[PDB]
Write an enzyme that holds these catalytic residues in place. Structure first.
Site, mmCIF file in Angstrom:
data_model
loop_
_atom_site.group_PDB
_atom_site.id
_atom_site.type_symbol
_atom_site.label_atom_id
_atom_site.label_comp_id
_atom_site.label_asym_id
_atom_site.label_seq_id
_atom_site.Cartn_x
_atom_site.Cartn_y
_atom_site.Cartn_z
ATOM 1 N N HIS B 78 45.528 108.074 85.175
ATOM 2 C CA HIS B 78 44.100 108.217 85.747
ATOM 3 C C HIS B 78 43.048 109.230 85.045
ATOM 4 O O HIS B 78 43.719 110.039 84.230
ATOM 5 C CB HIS B 78 44.239 108.398 87.250
ATOM 6 N N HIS B 80 41.367 111.527 85.197
ATOM 7 C CA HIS B 80 41.130 113.243 85.522
ATOM 8 C C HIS B 80 41.530 114.012 84.297
ATOM 9 O O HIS B 80 42.092 113.372 83.583
ATOM 10 C CB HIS B 80 42.157 113.961 86.839
ATOM 11 N N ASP B 82 43.047 116.541 83.425
ATOM 12 C CA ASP B 82 44.703 116.832 83.243
ATOM 13 C C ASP B 82 45.503 115.784 82.621
ATOM 14 O O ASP B 82 46.483 115.772 82.305
ATOM 15 C CB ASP B 82 45.296 117.713 84.336
ATOM 16 N N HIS B 83 45.042 114.506 82.508
ATOM 17 C CA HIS B 83 45.880 113.251 82.269
ATOM 18 C C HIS B 83 45.051 112.746 80.864
ATOM 19 O O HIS B 83 45.626 111.944 80.133
ATOM 20 C CB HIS B 83 46.019 112.370 83.225
ATOM 21 N N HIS B 156 43.837 108.219 94.652
ATOM 22 C CA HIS B 156 43.377 109.526 94.017
ATOM 23 C C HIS B 156 42.344 109.674 93.098
ATOM 24 O O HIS B 156 41.601 110.635 93.027
ATOM 25 C CB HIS B 156 45.013 109.987 93.434
ATOM 26 N N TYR B 190 34.226 116.532 99.395
ATOM 27 C CA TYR B 190 34.688 115.185 99.615
ATOM 28 C C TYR B 190 35.295 115.048 100.706
ATOM 29 O O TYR B 190 36.283 116.005 101.259
ATOM 30 C CB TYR B 190 35.495 114.635 98.417
HETATM 31 ZN ZN LIG Z 1 44.480 113.642 89.311
HETATM 32 ZN ZN LIG Z 2 46.798 115.505 87.560
#
Ligand SMILES: [Zn+2]
Ligand SMILES: [Zn+2]
Ligand SMILES: [Zn+2]
Ligand SMILES: [Zn+2]
Ligand SMILES: [Zn+2]
Ligand SMILES: [Zn+2]
Lengths: 269, 269
Positions: B78, B80, B82-83, B156, B190
């Protein structure tokens, strides 16, 4: 302690009924499989063995404390007399419809196959089945929480069908595969290699081998139990594990080799 | 003997790269997963961890004796930071296209998400990805004999994707699942429960939980390794089995409970 079954056992030699895994039970003979898949909403019966095995299958269901009248669906591997033989008798005792694919229906209605069956000339007569539901080639037979999926498996017969479902012991759930017979056997006349007599038939047999090889397969069972080493895996003579995720692959690969040997035999004669 | 990773480990704390199973290798950090799936025809890289982790992932590929230049496809859980953080850097080193689903593409192109992301306001900026192939929601990324299947996993994030494939050690072949994050986390603004602000979003999150729960799942890995207990299953601190066919079910059920707790929190505040 009981002796259990031989691998050459007569198709009608009795077997002690017993659990295979979870809610999948063995209720056939030493030589011919039949399975009962149970729930509190009703059961599914897999196969009918020979024309002589009906009373054994019913007694075996009862031996386990289930009632034939609670079976809501009967499914079939293939339309040979050694698997379909007691279907009509079982339909009477259970009240359940029998589910089969389109290419098997005429044979189930006549109680005899036609020349599309490799083994046409050696068929034995059986009782016609009165109530058959024609099932689509990846259709699902549903009874309460049970769901058995059809995997079209033509080759050994036109109507051959393998079946797959999930059975659980607690949270350990396994993909059961009742893979149809894959033997390239025939009567004295039939030639798998004579495509003009049955166009596409042999190609579809090859396609079946590939399809069965690719199934997610935790526990394999076959209409002839020795074709999957069943009695080396359950019952008194067991020495190999029940679960083997390679089993379908190895079953199909062995059947491919044997199919190719049949082709070589036909070339030579 | 090395100490291995903590479960609270920093997203950028280095991890010893190592085999997970067969041709699936771990090349991420202690806190963030990345996987390398190898063949002699080229490799597939799964995820890019943080914007700071690119050099670690490249060094880790090399530590195992593979060449980044032999990666032919990069896939993403996904969008984000951090990925996806080192995706562009990894594309430069590998030459490989990055595959993502339609709802993730604008974020990958901007290097920042929009308000559709629950965590919009806390996003960190990352390098835009130049070459992205939009993948269909059950599409397959193929490199030589490798085939990784996408399982759309929105919730997510809008673009969340889980991945599944088969890895073998000899003839023992296992269904690998890299299931996406399922945490119902957000920025301070959110509200998952405000359907008018994002119609259908929360329902699709629920659908994702059901889909992941139903996958055939022999070995589970997750973008945050602690979400699947990875370091209790591989590496120096391992004490539970690597293979657990219940893992996806339990992962999704735990995430459902946590999603419902998030809903209760929103109701209260
Ligand atoms: Zn995430
Ligand atoms: Zn993450
Ligand atoms: Zn037969
Ligand atoms: Zn038979
Ligand atoms: Zn399996
Ligand atoms: Zn499995």
């Amino acid at each position: 302690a009981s002796r259990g079954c031989a691998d050459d056992a007569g198709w009608n030699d009795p077997a002690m009924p017993q659990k295979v895994y979870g809610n999948t039970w063995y209720v056939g003979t030493c030589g011919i499989s039949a399975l009962l898949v149970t729930s509190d909403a009703g059961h599914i019966l897999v196969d009918a063995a020979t024309p002589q095995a009906g009373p054994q299958i019913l007694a075996n269901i009862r031996a386990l404390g289930f009632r034939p009248e609670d079976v809501r669906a009967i499914v079939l591997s293939h339309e040979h007399f050694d698997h379909a033989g007691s279907l009509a008798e079982l339909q009477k005792a259970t009240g359940a419809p029998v589910y089969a694919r389109a290419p098997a229906i005429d044979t189930l209605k006549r109680g005899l196959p036609d020349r599309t069956d490799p083994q046409f000339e050696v068929a034995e007569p059986v009782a016609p089945v009165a109530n058959i539901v024609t099932l689509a080639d990846d259709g699902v037979v549903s009874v309460g929480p049970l769901a058995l999926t059809a995997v079209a498996s033509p080759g050994h017969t036109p109507g051959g069908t393998s079946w797959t479902w999930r059975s659980c012991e607690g949270d350990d759930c396994r993909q059961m595969v009742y893979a149809d017979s894959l033997t390239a056997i025939s009567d004295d006349v039939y030639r798998y290699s004579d495509d003009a007599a049955h166009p596409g038939y042999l190609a579809a047999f090859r396609n079946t081998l590939a399809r069965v090889a690719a199934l997610d397969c935790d526990i394999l069972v076959t209409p002839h139990p020795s074709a999957s080493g069943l009695w080396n895996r359950i019952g008194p003579r067991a020495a190999a594990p029940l679960m083997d995720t390679t089993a379908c692959r190895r079953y199909a690969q062995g059947a491919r080799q044997r199919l190719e040997k049949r082709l070589a035999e036909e070339a030579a004669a």
